[PDB]
């Protein structure tokens, strides 16, 4: 079954992993933004 | 003496089950209530089960008369008698014994 994996989770690790700068500055991150931007998402990251 | 709803141990002398050797929630229960398909696929009539106990008539036979006091109004009999103090009981000559002598039966009527 699922586990409580978000216990003790901080919001500084959310910007370093799934933030916006982590995606525009990486080759594989531009795809995610372009993919999410083509679908029409508002929340491109974090 | 009425005893309300009695279980299997008090009402029918069921032995019960174990206390500590792994028993789960079944220490004073009745256990099995019959066989399976070959025994009728039903609980058989006359099965001993929990229910109300007491408050039923009971006879004690062959109790001698130790004392007879007219002033006090008491008739002391050997042994125990069914019921609680202040309960009405029926006293009569024993049925499994010879009736009282003929002379006595006439003296009392006289």
């Amino acid at each position: 079954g699922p586990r409580p994996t978000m216990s003790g989770a901080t919001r500084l690790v959310q910007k370093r992993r799934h933030g916006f700068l982590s995606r525009v500055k990486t080759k594989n991150g531009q795809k995610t933004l372009k993919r999410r931007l083509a679908k029409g998402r508002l929340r491109l990251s974090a | 003496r009425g005893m309300g709803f009695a279980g299997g141990m008090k009402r029918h002398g069921f032995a019960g089950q174990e206390a500590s050797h792994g028993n789960s929630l079944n220490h004073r229960t009745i256990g099995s209530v019959g066989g399976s398909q070959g025994s009728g696929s039903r609980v058989l009539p006359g099965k001993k089960m929990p229910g109300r106990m007491g408050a039923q008539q009971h006879t004690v036979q062959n109790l001698p008369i130790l004392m007879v006091d007219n002033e006090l109004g008491i008739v002391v009999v050997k042994g125990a008698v069914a019921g609680h103090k202040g309960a009405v009981v029926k006293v009569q000559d024993a049925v499994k014994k010879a009736p009282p002598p003929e002379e006595f039966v006439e003296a009392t009527k006289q």
Partner: protein, 192 residues
């Protein structure tokens, strides 16, 4: 399967059930009356009548036992061995009265009652009977045998007695307390 209960347990523990009775008897003596549930009013009635018996004793063992029942002895002991002792000197028992009333709490609809001290400043049967006699005199009716029987009960052992009861009736007429009271001769004609 065992023996019958000696008294009411009131779904409480031993220590919790003794404090409940010491608190009901403490509020009764302090306030002269309490409105509670009926089972509690009947369990505290036996302890309230056994505490007033200790207030009519001359030994110290009674003064130490009465100190162990109340929760504020320093404030309530003078009243116990004072006013309360003087009031019940001539009465042989029956110092308290339990009267059933409508549910105090409408959520649970639990039967309630009023445990009070007879011949006290807040006797509810003394004021209810004075209100019945105040309505009979203001309506030119005749009191029933049950009212005359209650008039003597609430005035036999009272200090002032009848004089304190006539003043209660007089105050209930100058105040117009029986205004709007249905005459007893018209009860047979009322469906609701």
């Amino acid at each position: 399967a065992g023996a019958h209960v000696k008294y009411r347990h009131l779904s409480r523990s031993s220590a919790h059930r003794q404090a409940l009775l010491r608190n009901l008897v403490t509020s009764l003596i302090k306030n002269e009356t309490i409105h509670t549930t009926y089972p509690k009013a009947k369990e505290a009635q036996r302890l309230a009548e056994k505490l007033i018996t200790l207030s009519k004793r001359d030994t110290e063992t009674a003064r130490r036992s009465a100190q162990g029942i109340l929760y504020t002895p320093d404030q309530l002991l003078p009243k116990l061995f004072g006013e309360i002792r003087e009031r019940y000197a001539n009465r042989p028992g029956g110092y308290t009265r339990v009267l059933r009333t409508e549910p105090k709490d409408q959520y649970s609809q639990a039967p309630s009652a009023i445990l009070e001290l007879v011949d006290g400043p807040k006797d509810m049967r003394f004021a209810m009977t004075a209100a019945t006699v105040a309505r009979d005199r203001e309506q030119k009716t005749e009191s029933t045998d049950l009212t005359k029987k209650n008039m003597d009960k609430v005035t036999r052992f009272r200090k002032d007695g009848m004089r304190a009861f006539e003043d209660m009736v007089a105050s209930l007429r100058d105040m117009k307390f029986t205004a709007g009271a249905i005459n007893p001769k018209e009860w047979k004609k009322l469906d609701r």
